[PDB]
């Protein structure tokens, strides 16, 4: 499958929308530090078995 740029990143908290917009890209002028997200992106991968 294709990889999409979204804000629906799995396993995230309020820190997501804190810096990121409704789309998944950080607002122009936001203060970011080591660890924060700049562009939300997810890649398809099923299976895994678990």
């Amino acid at each position: 499958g294709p990889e999409e740029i979204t804000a629906d990143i799995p396993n995230v908290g309020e820190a997501a929308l804190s810096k990121l917009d409704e789309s998944g890209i950080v607002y122009i002028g936001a203060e970011v530090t080591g660890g924060d997200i700049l562009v939300g992106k997810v890649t398809p991968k099923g299976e895994t078995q678990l």
């Binding site: 908290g13 309020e14 804190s18 607002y27 002028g29 530090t33």
Partner: protein, 323 residues
């Protein structure tokens, strides 16, 4: 106790050459003490002094500090750098919000700032901006705080204002009001004995502080610090912190971490429910009788609670231990 001789130092003439430069003379001094108090007073004056400084600045139409604005010859960075050297003297506060509105052609100084009754501005001629076209206008909110010893914006990564809007521009702080400090011993012509000196303290500040409270606060710090040099009990720390959490550490987090709707957040903030440790042990019976809390809000709560593994209306009669 009955020993020693010694003398005592006292303040004489405080020659105020200018609003910044000053001279504090201490005449009643011996030989050794006159040279000893020099470095002590100098260091505590060149560092451990109070003073006010700008910390945050919010400008309309400006997001980050690397942007520009129409009709402004200076860029935002230069404007912030000008606000760095803003001589402010607050009366009786620890934080003040100075508003600054100004339009039309001409230079914008510290005088264009709304003259507050508490804020005393030393140099209202301080250059802040330079508006060009007559149709240009600016309106910024300046924040001044009381502090000591530098401390830039890099220190506070995000330990202040959990949200803090985009417009807020953090500026480094130069708290110490004292620029330079010099001192000379010099033989004192004290009309009395013959072997006495007069510690002359040459001072240069920004005018946001007077030599009186300056020297007194300095000597005060020296005295308070020498206080621990009296008795020496050699007091140790007990340490031995407890390493056994009786309950899940997540219950120590506030309801904000639940990440729910605003209405439900206000309901929990009104029902005196701060931490999730109270929401986890609150039944639907009590949740129904909560003002402005319907099926949508109740479903919201159970979903955001069940997703985190926890449930609703449990019991853990151990709340909270045990500091």
């Amino acid at each position: 106790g009955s020993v020693t001789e010694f003398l005592k130092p006292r303040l004489v003439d405080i020659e105020q050459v200018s609003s910044t430069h000053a001279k504090v003379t201490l005449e009643p001094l011996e030989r050794g003490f006159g040279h000893t108090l020099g470095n002590a007073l100098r260091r505590i004056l060149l560092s451990s002094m109070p003073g006010c400084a700008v910390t945050e600045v919010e400008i309309d139409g400006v997001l980050h500090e690397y942007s520009t604005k129409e009709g402004v010859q200076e860029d935002i960075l230069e404007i912030l750098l000008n606000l760095k050297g803003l001589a402010v003297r607050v009366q009786g506060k620890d934080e003040v919000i100075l508003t600054l509105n100004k339009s039309g052609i001409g230079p914008v100084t510290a005088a264009d700032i709304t003259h507050d009754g508490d804020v005393e501005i030393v140099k209202p001629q301080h250059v802040i901006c330079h508006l060009t076209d007559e149709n240009a206008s600016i309106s910024m909110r300046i924040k001044v705080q009381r502090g000591r010893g530098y401390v830039p914006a890099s220190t506070r990564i995000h330990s202040e204002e959990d949200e803090r809007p985009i417009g807020r521009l953090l500026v480094d702080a130069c708290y110490s009001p004292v620029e330079r400090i010099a001192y000379n011993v010099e033989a004192a012509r004290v009309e009395q004995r013959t072997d006495l000196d007069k510690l002359v303290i040459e001072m240069e500040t920004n005018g946001t502080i007077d030599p009186e409270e300056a020297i007194r606060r300095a000597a005060t710090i020296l005295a308070e610090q020498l206080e621990a040099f009296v008795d020496l009990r050699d007091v140790r720390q007990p340490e031995v912190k407890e390493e056994k959490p009786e309950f899940d550490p997540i219950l120590l987090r506030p309801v904000d971490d639940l990440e729910l709707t605003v209405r439900s957040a206000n309901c929990l903030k009104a029902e005196a429910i701060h931490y999730i440790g109270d929401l986890v042990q609150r039944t639907e019976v009590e949740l129904l009788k909560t003002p402005n809390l319907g099926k949508k809000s109740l479903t919201e709560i159970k979903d955001v609670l069940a997703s985190r593994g926890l449930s609703l209306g449990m019991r853990l009669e151990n709340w909270p231990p045990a500091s």
